[PDB]
Write a protein that binds this ligand. Sequence first.
Ligand SMILES: [Cl-]
Ligand SMILES: [Cl-]
Ligand SMILES: [Mg+2]
Ligand SMILES: [Mg+2]
Ligand SMILES: [Mg+2]
Ligand SMILES: [Mg+2]
Ligand SMILES: [Mg+2]
Ligand SMILES: [Mg+2]
Length: 326
Amino acid sequence: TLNGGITDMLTELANFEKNVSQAIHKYNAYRKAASVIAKYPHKIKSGAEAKKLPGVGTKIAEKIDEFLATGKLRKLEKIRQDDTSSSINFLTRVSGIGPSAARKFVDEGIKTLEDLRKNEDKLNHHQRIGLKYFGDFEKRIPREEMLQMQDIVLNEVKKVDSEYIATVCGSFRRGAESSGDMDVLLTHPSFTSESTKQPKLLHQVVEQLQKVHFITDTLSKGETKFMGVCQLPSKNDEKEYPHRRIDIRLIPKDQYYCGVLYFTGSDIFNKNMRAHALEKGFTINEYTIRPLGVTGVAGEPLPVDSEKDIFDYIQWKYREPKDRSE
DNA sequence: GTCGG
DNA sequence: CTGATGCGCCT
DNA sequence: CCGACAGGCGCATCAG
Ligand SMILES: [Cl-]
Ligand SMILES: [Cl-]
Ligand SMILES: [Mg+2]
Ligand SMILES: [Mg+2]
Ligand SMILES: [Mg+2]
Ligand SMILES: [Mg+2]
Ligand SMILES: [Mg+2]
Ligand SMILES: [Mg+2]
C-alpha cells in the first residue's frame, strides 16, 4: 500500500479515540483523513504535503512528520503499552461489545477472552454469540464463498415466494475479492412505504434459512432488520467453513434505490455522500432523499428511479459500486 | 480533529 | 405498560 | 473561532 504506514497509523488513532476516548467525532476525523490519504496517488513526503488534503489538518500533519521522520508515533507507542487501553480496545473486537461495555468489563477485571468465557453470564445475547464465534468473525470471506452463499440465499428466498428480490450488497456488490460479512437487501411487493399487506415478510425468509441450516444463530431480529450468523454446508470428511455474519435488511419496494445505495456503502462513502447532500440542502437515508427547509427540517421524499437520480440531486457524477470503496 | 463561513 | 435515551450495530 | 460532523434499527435500561 502506497502510504500504508500513515493510514495504518491513522486507523489505530481512530480506533483509540473511538474505543478508549469514546470521542466519536475524533474517530470520524481520523478515518476521514485515513480515507483521503489512501486514495492520494503520490507517496507522501511530508506533513505539509498531506495538509493540502481535505480532512488533514495541523495535528495530523504534525503526526505525519513524526511518523515520516522516525517510523513511529510516540503517542501510539504509549497507547500500545498502556494495559487498560489495549484491553478496552481488545474487548471491542467481540461483536456486541462497544466502548462502554468494554470499559465496564475492564474496570471489573475482565481483560481477555479467558475472562469473558468465565463471565458469560455477564454478557447479553449478542455478546455471547460474538464471543462464541470470535475467531470465525475475524476471518474474511473469499468471493468464491460469497458466491455460494448468494446462491443459497437467493434460491431459498425464491422458494418462500418468487416475488421476493434479494440483492447481496456491502463489499460484495462493490466487487471486492473478499468480504467481512454478507449483507442482503430484501424487497417484496406487499411491503411499500404506503402499505404492509402481508405480515412476517422478513421472518419467513429467516425461518426458511433456519430450516435448511444456513442461518445458525440470531443476534437481533425485528420487522425490517435481521442480524445473525450463517454457515456454508461442507462435504464428507471436510473441515467446516467458518461461521459468518449475515445481515438482512427488508426495505420498502418503492424505496429500493435509497436502500441499495445505503447498503452498498462503503461506510465512509455513505458519510461523505450524506454530508455532501447536507451542503446541497438535502438529507439522505436508506429510505429517501428529502429537501432541507430553511428551518432545517426535512420535507417530502423526492422521486427516485435509480441510484443515479440520487447522485444527480446532489450534483455528483455517478460512481459505480466498485468505485465506492475504501 | 477539521473546516466553512 | 409507555416513552425516552443511549449503546452497538450496519452501510 | 465554533457548531457541525450521517442516519437509524433493535435492544436494554430506566422513570413513572
Ligand atoms: Cl506507531
Ligand atoms: Cl424517510
Ligand atoms: Mg487540509
Ligand atoms: Mg464490538
Ligand atoms: Mg458487509
Ligand atoms: Mg453487514
Ligand atoms: Mg463494514
Ligand atoms: Mg449513536
